[PDB]
Nucleic acid binder design. Structure first.
Ligand SMILES: [K+]
Ligand SMILES: [K+]
Ligand SMILES: [K+]
Ligand SMILES: [K+]
Ligand SMILES: [K+]
Ligand SMILES: [K+]
Ligand SMILES: [K+]
Ligand SMILES: [K+]
Ligand SMILES: [K+]
Ligand SMILES: [K+]
Ligand SMILES: [K+]
Ligand SMILES: [K+]
Ligand SMILES: [Mg+2]
Ligand SMILES: [Mg+2]
Ligand SMILES: [Mg+2]
Ligand SMILES: [Mg+2]
Ligand SMILES: [Mg+2]
Ligand SMILES: [Mg+2]
Ligand SMILES: [Mg+2]
Ligand SMILES: [Mg+2]
Ligand SMILES: [Mg+2]
Ligand SMILES: [Mg+2]
Ligand SMILES: [Mg+2]
Ligand SMILES: [Mg+2]
Ligand SMILES: [Mg+2]
Ligand SMILES: [Mg+2]
Ligand SMILES: [Mg+2]
Ligand SMILES: [Mg+2]
Ligand SMILES: [Mg+2]
Ligand SMILES: [Mg+2]
Ligand SMILES: [Mg+2]
Ligand SMILES: [Mg+2]
Ligand SMILES: [Mg+2]
Lengths: 142, 171, 209, 38, 6
RNA sequence: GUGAAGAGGGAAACAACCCAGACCGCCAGCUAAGGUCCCAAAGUCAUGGUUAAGUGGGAAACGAUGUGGGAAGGCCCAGACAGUCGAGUCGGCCUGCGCGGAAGA
RNA sequence: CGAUGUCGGCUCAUCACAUCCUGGGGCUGAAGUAGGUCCCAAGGGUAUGGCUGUUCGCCAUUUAAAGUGGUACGCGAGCUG
RNA sequence: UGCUGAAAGCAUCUAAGCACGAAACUUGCCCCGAGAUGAGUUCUCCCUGACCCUUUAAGGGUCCUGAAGGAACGUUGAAGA
């Protein structure tokens, strides 16, 4: 007997909708990363995307402890010499609040083609509305 | 602590509304509002709320603020500034104090909502209001234009200042 | 406010009575015809599209023609957009004329700079030439060093090197309006503006005040 | 302002205070005694 | 010329 | 003692450190060091404390009402200590964990 | 060591900040003008000549200023010699 | 640098709260920019035929059809190796 392997063409994927309001960033992200990868399913298979689609609402109201709201810094480099750029958490929330969740979750997903594919199933929104009523997402308390 | 353990007697013609942490003292002079710290519990007696480390310190602040809110509505606060220096004048026009302080431009300080001002002399400003924090801030802002210098005391001072002067060296 | 699309006619001067010679670019601004009004509902931003001039009926494609037919305007030689400020309102079909600039003191003028083709670093970047003589071997106008050594062991992005020069969008800001001639469809602006004679210019009121 | 690793009361009028997370000395009497970086 | 000459 | 002449697991990566000595096969099980929120296998384990510095996750003399614990002491409802007043207050000692001192291509 | 071209100059730079100038401040044995000293700040700017292979330095005359360092004592498959 | 302010009856810019503060930072100005594979938006234009077979499926052929537009070729350009 060979061990079961999930097959991408028969993988069942459900839609979920989460509310980020007041949730601790990192404790939310681990739960998102887990579910996007499909670690919560018996059919979990390292090389197959068995996870779920997750809509995240109210990304702008995600919480952080300590002095992270001012002191957590997001660095990136533009590729040009001297091009080291930075933004605090509060700046990132003001400008581009969906990036906060997305950056946290992306750091917790596998690197490589499949990790990038897993990330595509995360739909983050700044506010309390989404355009995905067609997909009929169920509420997920995490 | 000692400050918090000492109640605020509300006098006659004062009324209070405790909407949770939010409070609204109101009397003759005006209507003042403060949202207190979540560690404080008011009833006026102030006391620490359980499940908070800095309860007594926060209570003592909340006490002191509501005591000033009481003085705010009954008596109001008064802050006096005087203009030392040749040519240093002041004058009020509605809610705009116009100062001459030896600049090449005119200084016209816009007063905030609560605060009024009067110039009994050209070299005196007497601002009045309900909020003790706000009169303090307006007075500081006026003082900031031309702070008292240490050689002849020239500038905007608080009436109450001992403005230490010093001599201009030997030779 | 909005600007208008014009054509660089060429340069001249205006002699003032008090002796001064003012160098002017003459910009022909024929009517700009509103061809579309972008709304915050349908488009997510407020703007007008305009056409100016004329195109050969046979060289205007069916897609292009239908777009002009909806507007109810004659085909022009192109389409340009101008962001509307708060309070500015225009209708489709409206002709906007050079009279727009009648009380405008300064303009910014945008055009496509003359094309220098492939330019060396001397011309393109004002690099200093190396010695004409004193032993120089084949290295008179060549760029010199392009980096350091093992650290960092690469050339940095944005390094100034030879390449295509000119033939790109340039804006010259804060040019004085010398004259607005509505009768002749002319705008005279003081000083040079980008591009060859005959080239299209976008003229907007100066953004710096 | 004296900026020093060792900050100390110099006057009887000098007062140690921690503002943000910086130890400072404030003296009402003498502004030469004002210090930080304690 | 001599690499790492005398 | 190991490497040399030694693979495997841990220490991100890392001959020489820690665990451990590969005869071959297995889609069985138990453990070592080291680990158990996600990358990434296993406790978002239990109970009681401490820290607020992202300390943890680099550094000294020395500096300081940071904060936790301990043992004593001076003074005090013949009213202390701080500005009549009405209960604690002052300064040293020993200790836990933090803070400044702390600039590089 | 079956070769990692070696000083300086030229050309072209790029980074650090222990800041030379310009910007913001505190103290002054700060009257003012001008300084001293320390703190914050790296955005941009930061001479030309005489002499010497020079780096450096001295000198002349400027300048708001003529910074200090790292980059194989940056840069010879870019030049010089 | 302050305001209000306790802990600590005082004091205290700070612990709660509030204000000010620089060429640094985010913008504002100019240019590139949807390969932004997260490949976006708006406007306009075009195509409205039949059949056959097999492993019957986002299947493969046949005949008729050939749009919008594009390219090619030519005359060329203040565009260009
Ligand atoms: K030669
Ligand atoms: K051995
Ligand atoms: K850390
Ligand atoms: K060698
Ligand atoms: K100074
Ligand atoms: K700088
Ligand atoms: K350098
Ligand atoms: K070398
Ligand atoms: K050389
Ligand atoms: K080489
Ligand atoms: K060569
Ligand atoms: K696109
Ligand atoms: Mg990996
Ligand atoms: Mg050309
Ligand atoms: Mg030259
Ligand atoms: Mg030769
Ligand atoms: Mg030659
Ligand atoms: Mg590399
Ligand atoms: Mg050997
Ligand atoms: Mg080994
Ligand atoms: Mg390993
Ligand atoms: Mg086991
Ligand atoms: Mg796991
Ligand atoms: Mg650390
Ligand atoms: Mg330490
Ligand atoms: Mg070799
Ligand atoms: Mg510095
Ligand atoms: Mg920078
Ligand atoms: Mg070298
Ligand atoms: Mg050569
Ligand atoms: Mg070389
Ligand atoms: Mg020789
Ligand atoms: Mg107080």
């Amino acid at each position: 007997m060979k061990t079961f392997t999930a097959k991408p063409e028969t993988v069942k994927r459900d839609w979920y909708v989460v509310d980020a309001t007041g949730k601790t960033l990192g404790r939310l992200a681990t739960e998102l990363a887990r579910r996007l990868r499909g670690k919560h399913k018996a059919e979990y298979t390292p090389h197959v995307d068995t996870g779920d689609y997750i809509i995240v609402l109210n990304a702008d109201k995600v919480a952080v402890t300590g002095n992270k709201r001012t002191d957590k810094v997001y660095y990136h480099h533009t590729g040009h010499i001297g091009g080291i750029k930075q933004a605090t958490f509060e700046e990132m929330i003001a400008r581009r609040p969906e990036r906060v969740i997305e950056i946290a979750v992306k750091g917790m997903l596998p690197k490589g083609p499949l990790g990038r594919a897993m990330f595509r199933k995360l739909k983050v929104y700044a506010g309390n509305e989404h355009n995905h009523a067609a997909q009929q997402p169920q509420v997920l308390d995490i | 602590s000692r400050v918090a353990k000492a109640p605020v007697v509300v006098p006659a013609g004062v009324d209070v509304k405790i909407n949770g942490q939010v409070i609204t003292i109101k009397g003759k002079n005006g209507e003042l509002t403060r949202t207190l710290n979540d560690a404080v519990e008011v009833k006026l007696t102030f006391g620490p709320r359980d499940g908070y480390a800095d309860g007594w310190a926060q209570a003592g602040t909340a006490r002191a603020l509501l005591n000033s809110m009481v003085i705010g509505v009954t008596e109001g606060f008064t802050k006096k500034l005087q203009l030392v220096g040749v040519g240093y004048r002041a004058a009020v026009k509605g809610n705009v104090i116009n100062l001459s302080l030896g600049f090449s431009h005119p200084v016209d300080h816009q007063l905030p909502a609560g605060i009024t001002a009067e110039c009994p002399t050209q070299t005196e400003i007497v601002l009045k209001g309900a909020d003790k924090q706000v009169i303090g801030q307006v007075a500081a802002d006026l003082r900031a234009y031309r702070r008292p210098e240490p050689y002849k005391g020239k500038g905007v001072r608080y009436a109450d200042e001992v403005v230490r002067t010093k001599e201009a060296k030997k030779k | 406010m909005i600007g208008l699309v014009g054509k660089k006619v060429g340069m001249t001067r205006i002699f003032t009575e008090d002796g001064v010679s003012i160098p002017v670019t003459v910009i022909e601004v024929e009517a700009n015809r509103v061809t579309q009004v972008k709304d915050l509902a349908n488009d997510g931003y407020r703007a007008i599209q305009v056409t100016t001039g004329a195109k050969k009926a046979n060289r205007v494609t069916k897609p292009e023609a239908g777009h002009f037919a909806k507007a109810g305007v004659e085909a022009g030689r192109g389409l340009w957009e101008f962001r509307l400020a708060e309070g500015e309102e225009f209708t489709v079909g409206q002709s906007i004329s050079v009279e727009l600039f009648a009380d405008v003191k300064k303009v910014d003028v945008t055009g496509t700079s003359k094309g220098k083709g492939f330019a060396g670093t001397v011309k393109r970047w004002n690099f200093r030439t190396q010695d004409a003589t004193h032993g120089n071997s084949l290295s008179h106008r060549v760029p010199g060093s392009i980096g350091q050594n093992q650290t960092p062991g690469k050339v940095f992005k944005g390094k100034k090197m030879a390449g295509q020069m000119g033939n790109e969008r340039v804006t010259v800001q804060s040019l004085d309006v010398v004259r607005v001639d509505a009768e002749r469809n002319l705008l005279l602006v003081k000083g040079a503006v980008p591009g060859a004679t005959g080239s299209d210019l976008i003229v907007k009121p100066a953004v710096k005040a | 302002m004296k900026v020093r690793a060792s900050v100390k009361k110099l006057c009887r009028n000098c007062k140690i205070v921690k503002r943000d997370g910086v130890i400072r000395v404030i003296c009402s009497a003498e502004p030469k005694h004002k210090q930080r970086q304690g | 010329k001599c690499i790492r000459a005398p």
